[PDB]
């Protein structure tokens with residue numbers, strides 16, 4: 097297995113390549129690549145040029161057209177010795193796109209040929225300096241059969257084109273912007289193309305082109321609209337304009353991730369492009385908006401300024417995720433977006449930070465870089481950027497962005513460079529703050545308060561600590577922006593002050609323990625703590641149920657109201673899981689049910705907020721409330737809680753469900769909010785009197801005039817195991833079996849079903865007409881959903897879930913390591929479960945560990961999980 101690489105070993109390259117001219121003689125079985133690079137030595141004169149290469153058939157090596165004899169091929173490299181200070185390197189090699197099942201480098205997607213080069217896929221195309229601090233100007237000539245590949249695309253603009261004998265043709269592209277090879281892209285195939293235009297604020301007219309498989313034009317307008325929305329927003333919010341003449345996006349069916357920001361030629365998983373009202377849900381529309389925007393935002397945060405090395409991945413991913421969240425939030429509901437992102441942080445990222453794979457947002461050790469496009473690097477990375485925004489304020493934050501681009505435009509930078517730019521532009525000291533980049537694990541912030549009537553002072557005693565993680569035995573206090581707000585008994589905000597001077601609501605929690613005193617607090621306050629999730633930490637405060645219901649009705653920020661409800665539910669989710677383990681039924685105080693009844697009947701509350709408060713935490717969110725996870729107890733308690741609320745709020749739920757009916761379907765935020773609330777109510781109504789529920793659900797499925805409402809009904813039928821379930825599921829299959837993206841929703845429902853025979857059903861679906869092990873989307877929607885989204889079934893006491901996953905991973909380890917690595921994650925969490933389960937999970941991991949040709953992707957995770 098390959099050795100681990102460490103951030104502290106970074107060293108500038110001995111050679112730089114300033115320009116590269118590529119020529120591809122394209123063919124699915126045998127592609128011939130000719131690469132002419134202009135190299136310049138920067139290191140010692142006796143240093144050899146070390147080129148990275150994987151699975152390449154070397155044809156020849158020339159230096160200034162002279163056949164070179166001073167070279168040697170070694171594991172993953174071509175080492176060239178005795179070179180001039182400046183020279184022209186010419187490499188000719190062959191590759192086989194059709195044989196590329198890992199989908200890394202140049203591969204085949206259906207009948208099209210396309211690429212994926214990040215993190216290190218370009219080395220699978222030709223021998224090169226496959227490191228992001230080497231920026232070269234690319235020129236790409238593509239030669240191919242005209243009938244099979246009428247469209248030949250690469251980064252930049254077309255500078256040449258011609259016809260050849262034997263029905264072949266070629267096109268040459270030039271991208272003026274120097275770039276690391278991970279941003280290189282090539283696409284060849286036959287597509288339908290949606291063309292539009294966007295005029296920047298300064299007048300630059302940009303040609304927009306969206307390439308989709310023939311017959312998919314009816315699902316392309318929303319993505320195009322989202323691209324234009326993204327371009328406009330970046331101008332308005334960040335003052336950034338697109339910098340090229342054309343913007344191409346190609347939607348492909350076979351892609352390991354969601355999308356890729358290749359300069360001027362983004363390549364997208366079709367899941368994040370294709371949408372029409374009968375195939376896509378409101379969520380799909382908003383996800384397409386998010387991803388289209390995300391990759392577009394990389395044009396500046398990632399492309400114009402790239403990464404010095406891969407340990408600096410968060411420099412572009414954390415910042416770009418922050419940007420896509422601000423984009424979504426500005427255009428839609430900021431409260432809903434913040435709530436959703438906090439659910440991801442608390443329910444998924446915290447779990448990772450408490451797992452064997454824990455790492456700082458800026459990793460120190462990496463074996464397989466593809467294993468580091470994580471919730472930590474992305475989501476926590478964004479939370480760190482957001483904390484900088486919280487500490488600086490929008491104005492100074494933008495000044496920091498401006499200085500960052502001024503200093504690093506056209507180069508590869510580091511996380512430290514970014515922080516320095518923010519510090520220098522704002523004059524805000526971020527020296528202590530920097531620890532957020534080096535320390536893994538989730539900080540735990542404990543708060544104790546006291547109200548002194550004699551002095552009319554409110555005191556907060558705040559403590560912090562980060563438990564040790566398997567990767568770091570030493571932990572230190574962080575600079576935690578801790579936002580608060582105090583309310584009097586009328587729900588009015590109490591001015592924060594001390595010694596006659598106002599105090600900022602964002603407290604600087606920088607020590608292991610500290611006190612914060614506020615005077616002129618005339619009456620005992622109810623505090624709102626860690627407002628808007630001001631820092632990615634776990635809050636420990638002894639809330640009374642009344643303080644929480646008070647906040648649910650009076651908190652100024654909608655997020656606080658949702659957050660208070662989560663704290664209220666946590667107490668009873670924990671209470672009932674303990675009861676479940678002792679064979680006792682659900683117990684819930686009347687005043688708790690009343691709090692949710694109040695939310696339903698509050699006419700002043702935003703439907704968007706009400707919908708989220710009425711959406712119970714997922715089983716994965718619930719799992720984080722426990723030291724030792726009991727997946728079956730959690731799943732059954734979640735259903736029991738749903739049933740109890742459905743019974744206690746039956747009339748109110750139906751009233752709100754009916755009140756939010758909308759005849760017209762619009763992908764507009766106000767409409768989406770009402771529909772989300774209506775369907776939130778439907779989830780509960782599905783657990784009402786069987787016949788009543790069955791009729792209501794089947795009715796919505798059949799009368800729905802959009803996929804959002806149809807899927808909501810189908811999901812409810814499956815969740816409540818209603819009589820109509822089998823009929824509706826078969827009807828969906830018969831109508832959509834030919835559409836993979838649509839069937840993925842169906843596979844997810846089958847995989848996350850509460851039915852006793854779910855595994856048997858999932859295994860059988862491996863033979864379904866709409867499923868195929870060759871497609872990452874299908875794999876993740878069926879197998880991934882089962883293992884990661886149905887922990888109750890995956891963790892069946894008999895161990896059947898683990899055995900099934902081992903079978904699937906034995907296949908995927910050889911076929912597609914990246915997808916295999918995404919799928920093994922559930923097994924890596926073994927220490928969070930009981931002894932019996934740990935034993936079975938360890939056995940499963942040991943079996944995988946002994947696999948012939950074990951991929952580095954899995955090796956890295958298996959090793960840490962078995963430690």
Ligand SMILES: CC(C)C[C@H](NC(=O)[C@@H](O)[C@H](N)Cc1ccccc1)C(=O)O
Pocket residue numbers: 214215353354355356357386387390391394413417420466469
């Ligand atoms: C909206 C985005 C956060 C979705 C996300 N895509 C990205 O982050 C891209 O900008 C990544 N740069 C693409 C990528 C992902 C994984 C490994 C190598 C390369 C993805 O999941 O593909």
Ligand SMILES: [Zn+2]
Pocket residue numbers: 390391394412413416
């Ligand atoms: Zn990204």
